[PDB]
Amino acid sequence: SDTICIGYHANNSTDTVDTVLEKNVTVTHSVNLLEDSHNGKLCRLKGIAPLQLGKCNIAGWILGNPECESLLSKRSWSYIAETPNSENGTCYPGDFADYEELREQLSSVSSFERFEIFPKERSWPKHNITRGVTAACSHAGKSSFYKNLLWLTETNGSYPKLSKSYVNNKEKEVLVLWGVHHPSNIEDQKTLYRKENAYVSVVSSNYNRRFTPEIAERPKVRGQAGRMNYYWTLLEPGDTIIFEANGNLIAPWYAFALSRGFGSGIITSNASMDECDTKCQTPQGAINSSLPFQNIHPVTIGECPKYVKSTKLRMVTGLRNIP
Amino acid sequence: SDTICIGYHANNSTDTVDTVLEKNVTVTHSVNLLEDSHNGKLCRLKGIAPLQLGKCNIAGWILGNPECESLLSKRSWSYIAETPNSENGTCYPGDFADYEELREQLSSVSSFERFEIFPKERSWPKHNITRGVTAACSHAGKSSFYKNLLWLTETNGSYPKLSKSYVNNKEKEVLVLWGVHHPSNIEDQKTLYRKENAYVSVVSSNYNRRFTPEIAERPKVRGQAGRMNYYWTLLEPGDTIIFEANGNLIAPWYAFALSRGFGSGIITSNASMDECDTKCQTPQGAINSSLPFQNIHPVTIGECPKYVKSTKLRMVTGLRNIP
Amino acid sequence: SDTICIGYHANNSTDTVDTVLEKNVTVTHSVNLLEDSHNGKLCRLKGIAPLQLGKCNIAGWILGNPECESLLSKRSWSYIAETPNSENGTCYPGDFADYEELREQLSSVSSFERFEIFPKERSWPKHNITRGVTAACSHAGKSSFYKNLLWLTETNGSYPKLSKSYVNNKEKEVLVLWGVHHPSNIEDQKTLYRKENAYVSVVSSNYNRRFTPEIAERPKVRGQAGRMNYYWTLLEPGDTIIFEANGNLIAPWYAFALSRGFGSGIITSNASMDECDTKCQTPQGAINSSLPFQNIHPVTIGECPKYVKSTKLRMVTGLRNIP
Amino acid sequence: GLFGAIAGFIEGGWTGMIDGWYGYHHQNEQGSGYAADQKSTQNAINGITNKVNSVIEKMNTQFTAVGKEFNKLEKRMENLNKKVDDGFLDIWTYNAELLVLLENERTLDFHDSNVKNLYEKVKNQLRNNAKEIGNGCFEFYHKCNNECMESVKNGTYDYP
Amino acid sequence: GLFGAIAGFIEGGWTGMIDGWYGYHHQNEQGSGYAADQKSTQNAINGITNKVNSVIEKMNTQFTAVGKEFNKLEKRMENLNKKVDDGFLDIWTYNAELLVLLENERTLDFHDSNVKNLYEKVKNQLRNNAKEIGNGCFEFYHKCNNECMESVKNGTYDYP
Amino acid sequence: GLFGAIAGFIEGGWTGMIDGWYGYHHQNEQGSGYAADQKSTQNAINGITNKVNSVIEKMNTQFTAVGKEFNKLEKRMENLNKKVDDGFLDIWTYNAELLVLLENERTLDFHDSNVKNLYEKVKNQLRNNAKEIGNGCFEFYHKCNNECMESVKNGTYDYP
Ligand SMILES: *[C@@H]1O[C@H](CO)[C@@H](O[C@@H]2O[C@H](CO)[C@@H](O[C@@H]3O[C@H](CO)[C@@H](O)[C@H](O[C@H]4O[C@H](CO)[C@@H](O)[C@H](O)[C@@H]4O[C@H]4O[C@H](CO)[C@@H](O)[C@H](O)[C@@H]4O)[C@@H]3O)[C@H](O)[C@H]2NC(C)=O)[C@H](O)[C@H]1NC(C)=O
Ligand SMILES: *[C@@H]1O[C@H](CO)[C@@H](O[C@@H]2O[C@H](CO)[C@@H](O[C@@H]3O[C@H](CO)[C@@H](O)[C@H](O[C@H]4O[C@H](CO)[C@@H](O)[C@H](O)[C@@H]4O[C@H]4O[C@H](CO)[C@@H](O)[C@H](O)[C@@H]4O)[C@@H]3O)[C@H](O)[C@H]2NC(C)=O)[C@H](O)[C@H]1NC(C)=O
Ligand SMILES: *[C@@H]1O[C@H](CO)[C@@H](O[C@@H]2O[C@H](CO)[C@@H](O[C@@H]3O[C@H](CO)[C@@H](O)[C@H](O)[C@@H]3O)[C@H](O)[C@H]2NC(C)=O)[C@H](O)[C@H]1NC(C)=O
Ligand SMILES: *[C@@H]1O[C@H](CO)[C@@H](O[C@@H]2O[C@H](CO)[C@@H](O)[C@H](O)[C@H]2NC(C)=O)[C@H](O)[C@H]1NC(C)=O
Ligand SMILES: *[C@@H]1O[C@H](CO)[C@@H](O[C@@H]2O[C@H](CO)[C@@H](O)[C@H](O)[C@H]2NC(C)=O)[C@H](O)[C@H]1NC(C)=O
Ligand SMILES: *[C@@H]1O[C@H](CO)[C@@H](O[C@@H]2O[C@H](CO)[C@@H](O)[C@H](O)[C@H]2NC(C)=O)[C@H](O)[C@H]1NC(C)=O
Ligand SMILES: *[C@@H]1O[C@H](CO)[C@@H](O)[C@H](O)[C@H]1NC(C)=O
Ligand SMILES: *[C@@H]1O[C@H](CO)[C@@H](O)[C@H](O)[C@H]1NC(C)=O
Ligand SMILES: *[C@@H]1O[C@H](CO)[C@@H](O)[C@H](O)[C@H]1NC(C)=O
Ligand SMILES: *[C@@H]1O[C@H](CO)[C@@H](O)[C@H](O)[C@H]1NC(C)=O
């Protein structure tokens, strides 16, 4: 006798998915929705490589700490990656004004040129340009100082009032950094600046601040009982910045012509760089951005899938596997 | 032979909806869930019309920049709208303290009266009240100044210390604004205020700040190398505010008795104001708030449908259209 | 003839649930998803009792307002609870610097010891330590002052410059608070400190600030026309804080060695203390955190169910009740 | 589709039936016409309306001013605000799109179920006095006049 | 309702069946009584509890102090904070309300399905040894004693 | 399960059918083999792929740097930032898990329905020329050669 039967597919599959009524249901075909792994490497976003700081953090690198490598080309970066061993910042103790804000703004740049804004060899004819070194910023056993700043001091027994201006002839922003030095006692103030009451004045079209040195005995940091506070400003194209000072000015020596980009960020990662392109960067490494969810890290940079605390998220495509 | 059949509806409809299993499905009846259009007009929220500034931004309007229209009657508004062509603000260059915060707090007021807190003609008998004009704030080709401030200067070769007090006899907050003038050189400081070292002191029960003028040559903005910093405070009902000055005081002339409302915001719109009512305002125009979603703009004011990046969101109510 | 029928359960149940197609459907068995009630009591989170302030807010408690009860035993708390009747803060008028930030950081501590950082009787041998009382901070009808601060004044007709240092010999952070007094007139400034121009300097390894008194006639608050601004800093283990002063210094008398915990918060609550343990605290009382949603209050502390504006959320487990 | 009636054994729709969503088409010597079953179509009009109102009206929204202003030294606050706005945008966009996709599939299943149940209600009454053609029709073994027709739709079909 | 059994051809429930969710009511010369089908109801009791447990237990919540305090010159941060609280409130309220409505509809559809499958299981077993009464009952053409009755519930009904 | 075919009267799957998801197994005097019904499997392959792509492709995500940095006097802003991250983390985790839990049950229901409709398609064609054995099989009363077999699958089975 003849027969015909109706049936459905079965496979050798051992995939299991969860349903609302039953957990651990063996199915024939399934697709994963959860991005589960990274490549352990720092990759390029939008085709541009990140700025990798090693021994230095953003503070020490932008100031020119003697332990940081300087940028010698017209660079650009999609994000900033600093090492867990990036402990070289302000080798001379002091306060960095709006430091977190400067970091968020330097996180992504499309152009970045370092240039002599106030050349040491010709800008200060009536001040001493060589005494401004310190054991706090020592390099190779000798005393030094920041590579992008200049510590002006008295010469021939005087520190005359200075007025140095810079006009931004670049067609982009120019980040100008400087410092204000605060001695520990009135004797050290007289030795370096030959007056008890000095002042620093920095002005532009949108920036206007006067700095008065505060002299007081403080605890020693990096062997130094004095402090010098650090300040910066973004100078717009066509604008003028003017430094007017009686003393205690840590004058700018190099500045940075830059074009800031669509806000990125900073990851702290000991992972190494590879010649790869990614759309999503995790502190542990880059991840594929095709799936809608990832559980690698909540702090990501890029065009990223949403972070979930889940461990298993796959949708069944086939049937219940009943062999 | 007789028959009876079971069937379903079909019509000439061509509405299409998306399903999870099939796209572009022709259905008989459907309802839209996505708000898709605006009316291109600035409407009233909660029945109250917005404050639309024309040539001026919030800075210039509240200070009395000579190009801004003044409020004659006691007003009220649900939000503030400024034009992309609002380029008249602080015509004398300077820093506006906590400007974004003042904007957020003035965004919606339930009463707003402008009144002479310190009448120009009778409050300053021993200072000059007519010299305080400048080419930066010019109106109709002649030199002018803010309509709500007074630039006090010396008379008979002196600027004696002044102390004018105001008691808030109104039963609401009183927004008081004032300025401190910072000349470009010591000669202009001596000419205007007959002192090398002056001070401005503004105090209340919760506000306590002393201002020292910083004299320095700065780049020229609107032809002015000097600056004026602008300050404000909300004077609580019953409180007394005291101005004490040696010079450089840009004294208040008019103040504002106001009652702040449930926090609103500011939209920038070239769209025109109309006599319309809405429950949701978009910078491009008002939208209906009946549907749960809108795709016009993410920055809205009012009881608004949630903004989504979608282009089509309609739910099928009828059947598959099979004619 | 014999029969067998197929049917389903029905009971006396009156539970109703809402469905997408029909409202108010009577079902046989159902489960609640919405936590609807609290116990009206402040309980211990993470097994640790909160710090309950009574007459005082965090300002008055941490400074030692004469109306606050002290906890002379080493303590710890999981969160801070203050009453709606906590109106005792800074009884002498002034500004408390970064008060909200200090409140957020004292919200959770695992250890908290108050100790004599600068013993009143022997730290100031050439200053008067008994005159520093005021009618603004009166206790029991006699004038008093903060219990954790000391108002130094002149003695024998002089106020010599002081330099007092404290080294953090504790193995945790030490919260150090101090104040700067700004007299109402120059005559009282000479009376208390025997100088017109004085200065206060507080420094550590990471803190560097100079305070100069501003003398001006102000409105009387709590009967006082003068002001005292209050400042604080967290002194790291092993670090030194140095006070150097010419006058107007409200010197620290007691400080707090503490170890901050994983960030908690502050609730304002009319509810009372009970000997209970909870996983989620509401300003009205503790709630069960087993259900996924609660509608008691949106501002909670702990591992809490998500707050919803809903009034009924129940899932049907049984059938439609059709008797 | 899911219950096999609309895309299935009832191959197409009746443009001639304007009275409701589901109904009957009779053919006897007394006449012919389309008639909607107002009992079944009303329960679907009620159910769908309660579904549509649930998606729209359960959107409890308070007064809010989305826009925030920051200055040159507040870029972090600006990016945190952009994160808050963009986060809600992703959630609502994603949830709204899938909500329409999932519940539209269920609504179409709902009609399919209502059609098959209506067919099954008639089949249960006409037990074996008619041949089930397999296409949604019943060919009567006896003469069913209009009085008998109104009784099949009304639910009052006497069996003998 | 959706599968036509509960709101449909099996018009009502049995308060007499206290043993389980779905079952049988037999009547023979040996007696009559209610009996629950524990095989089918247990799979439903298991699935629904697994459904409810997934909704409650998948709520991963960390420690948080929701409230943040700001001063007179921090209103923007305060309103930005208000935006975050009101935003999460809108999302959870909308999703919570809709989830309970949608999944309650599915649970009742789920029960409807379990009853119809049980009915269809008996109909397929008795094939044509009994008349289908149309209300969930089967009138046997032969005498079915308790041994024959228990064999229908057990799933082992011999055809001859 | 929900439509009673897969977990129900068709007790198991066919490892012998590698051609598709649902199909037939015929046995006649001419021979025997498994054959997949490409009409049914393709609509499910189309629908399931459209469902899976909707979950993946509806994820509109912009460029974002999640991390934000704060200093010692910005603890409140730091805690507000964690609230935004953990709030999004709680929301996405909960919705993703339930979406997979709910929609996987529907996919299995979807297959069950396609299997049930295929059985129902054959039963309506083989109106009564074969006995339904109750396990998904039909025993022919007449000699059905391969042409008659292919005509059942093609949808064009002549009645006599
Ligand atoms: C770039 O980074 C590298 C790596 O971080 C830096 O190299 C480190 O430099 C520090 C110097 O600050 C060095 O640690 C010191 O070593 C000294 C020599 O033994 C110690 O004297 C010094 O002790 C001080 O700090 C201790 C910390 O608690 C105190 O307990 C101790 O008492 C000292 O404190 C002061 O006390 C008295 C006053 O009472 C004063 O006279 C003392 O001189 C002292 O100042 C530190 O332990 C690290 O070992 C170095 N690490 C490495 C790997 O080299 C490098 O300097 C950075 N360079 C730049 C340019 O930034
Ligand atoms: C701990 O907290 C408790 C309460 O929580 C404090 O007790 C309250 O303290 C207030 C303030 O002193 C006190 O109110 C005063 O009562 C006086 C009569 O007993 C009034 O004369 C006084 O009036 C002034 O304030 C009014 C505010 O509405 C003004 O309208 C009025 O004009 C007064 O202002 C004069 O004073 C100022 C100078 O202060 C001057 O510049 C003005 O021009 C004007 O001349 C107050 O209303 C309450 O009675 C107290 N209540 C209780 C229950 O004790 C307690 O002081 C706190 N303790 C500490 C140590 O902080
Ligand atoms: C209100 O806003 C308008 C628009 O900005 C102001 O007018 C503008 O004034 C500036 C100078 O203040 C003009 O720029 C200058 O132009 C002159 C020649 O015209 C040139 O010498 C300068 O180098 C500079 O380029 C600008 O053209 C002018 N624009 C318009 C449309 O008039 C006006 O001054 C503002 N008024 C107040 C009170 O703020
Ligand atoms: C700037 O000051 C430095 C002092 O540090 C001068 O260098 C010293 O010069 C004297 C004599 O000229 C020598 O005896 C020292 O040994 C030098 N010290 C160092 C560290 O080099 C320097 O000459 C001054 N330069 C100018 C232009 O005035
Ligand atoms: C206030 O300042 C104005 C402007 O400087 C003074 O007016 C000037 O007076 C001199 C003296 O006669 C005249 O030469 C100028 O022409 C006047 N200026 C203008 C614009 O008219 C005024 O005298 C000063 N004092 C008072 C009390 O107003
Ligand atoms: C510290 O200040 C107090 C208060 O000014 C001085 O005590 C006062 O002395 C006068 C006269 O001897 C008495 O009339 C007051 O009654 C005292 N007041 C109090 C509160 O005791 C005290 O002598 C000063 N001590 C030093 C060392 O300067
Ligand atoms: C799921 O079922 C398989 C069946 O073999 C079993 O091996 C596995 O351990 C189960 N997993 C869980 C989590 O129960
Ligand atoms: C330094 O000052 C003295 C003052 O007499 C002067 O003679 C000498 O020329 C000056 N040196 C330089 C290098 O200007
Ligand atoms: C949707 O389907 C119809 C079917 O006739 C087709 O004509 C139409 O082009 C499709 N939609 C679009 C946008 O092309
Ligand atoms: C729900 O129905 C019950 C009766 O079944 C009735 O007593 C009650 O008032 C109804 N509630 C609402 C909110 O409709």
Author numbering:
A (entry chain E), B (entry chain A), C (entry chain D): 2 to 324
D (entry chain a), E (entry chain d), F (entry chain e): 330 to 489
Task: Please quote the paper that reports this structure.
Hemagglutinin (HA) is an IVA surface protein that allows the virus to attach to host cell receptors and enter the cell. HA is a homotrimeric glycoprotein, with each monomer composed of two regions: (1) the head, comprising the receptor binding domain (RBD) which is crucial in viral attachment, and (2) the stalk, that is responsible for viral and cell membrane fusion in the endosome. Mammalian IVA infection is initiated through HAs binding to α2,6 sialic acid-linkage galactose receptors on the host cell surface, before entering the cell via endocytosis. Following endocytosis, HAs undergo conformational rearrangements due to the low pH of the endosome, leading to membrane fusion.
In addition, we also solved a 2.0 Å resolution crystal structure of the refolded head of A/Fort Monmouth/1/1947, which appears quite similar to the lower resolution full length mature trimer structure. The antibody C05 Fab failed to bind many of our other IVA HAs, as examined by analytical size exclusion chromatography. Failure to bind correlated with an insertion in HA between 146R-G147 of the epitope, whereas sequences without an insertion bound the antibody.
